[PDB]
From a paper:
The CARMA1 signalosome, which is composed of CARMA1 (caspase recruitment domain (CARD)-containing MAGUK protein 1), BCL10 (B-cell lymphoma 10) and MALT1 (mucosa-associated lymphoid tissue lymphoma translocation protein 1), is a macromolecular complex responsible for lymphocyte activation. CARMA1 forms intracellular multi-molecular complexes with BCL10 and MALT1 that are known as CARMA1 signalosomes during lymphocytes activation and proliferation, creating a primary signaling complex for the activation of NF-κB. CARMA1 contains an N-terminal CARD (CAspase Recruitment Domain) domain followed by a coiled-coil domain and a C-terminal MAGUK domain. For assembly of the CARMA1 signalosome, CARMA1 interacts directly with BCL10 via a CARD:CARD interaction and BCL10 interacts with MALT1 via an interaction between the C-terminal Ser/Thr-rich region of BCL10 and the first Ig domain of MALT1.
In this study, we report the dimeric structure of CARMA1 CARD at a resolution of 3.2 Å. Although CARMA1 CARD has a canonical six helical-bundles structural fold similar to other CARD domains, our structure shows the first homo-dimeric structure of CARD formed by a disulfide bond and reveals a possible biologically important homo-dimeric interface and novel homo-dimerization mechanism. The high resolution structure of CARMA1 CARD showed that it forms the canonical six-helical bundle fold comprising six helices, H1 to H6, which is characteristic of the DD superfamily. There was one dimer in the asymmetric unit, referred to as chain A and chain B. A flexible loop formed by residue 64 to residue 70 was missing from our model. The electron density of that region was too weak to trace, indicating that the loop is extraordinarily flexible relative to those of other CARD domains. Interestingly, H1 of CARMA 1 CARD was bent in the middle. An electrostatic interaction between H31 from one molecule and E27 from another molecule was the only non-covalent bond detected at the interface. Interestingly, an unexpected disulfide-bond formed by C28 from each molecule was detected. CARMA1 CARD exists as dimerand further oligomer mixture in solution and was all changed to the monomeric form by the addition of DTT and by mutating C28 to Alanine, indicating that CARMA1 CARD forms a stable dimer in solution and that the dimerization is mediated by a disulfide bond.
Author numbering:
A (entry chain B), B (entry chain A): 22 to 63, 71 to 108
The structure:
Amino acid sequence: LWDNVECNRHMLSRYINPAKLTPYLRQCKVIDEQDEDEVLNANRAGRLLDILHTKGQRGYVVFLESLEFYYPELYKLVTG
Amino acid sequence: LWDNVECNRHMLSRYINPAKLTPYLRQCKVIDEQDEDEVLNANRAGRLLDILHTKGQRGYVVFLESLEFYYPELYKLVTG
């Protein structure tokens, strides 16, 4: 069920601003400060998803919560 | 319907040499040499796909052929 986000790899990267998300992910200890700069200052969105696919269910749950909040319409697009 | 390619996007990237596909692709007349060395003279293959997206359905069709040809196992997963 990570294959939700993965189908939508293309368009998300196209619409989402990663910078808005990563804070809440930093907070929820899904990612650390190294991954936030690594995303932000290593298109950079694809990087974020890349690293999130490494994080299992805990990752997905949180990302989706952030995706819902800042990107509600896109999120519907992803979720069924 | 880019979906078969674009759901397997993460795993297609990790297992393709764009160098094997480009000359085929150019010659098919779907991409041009600017495209070829834009991609090549560089998920350095994410770009290849992204570019093909830009061509729509002919892009899709012809990308699928090159898998039928050069990564026949990848072709398999992609077509089911």
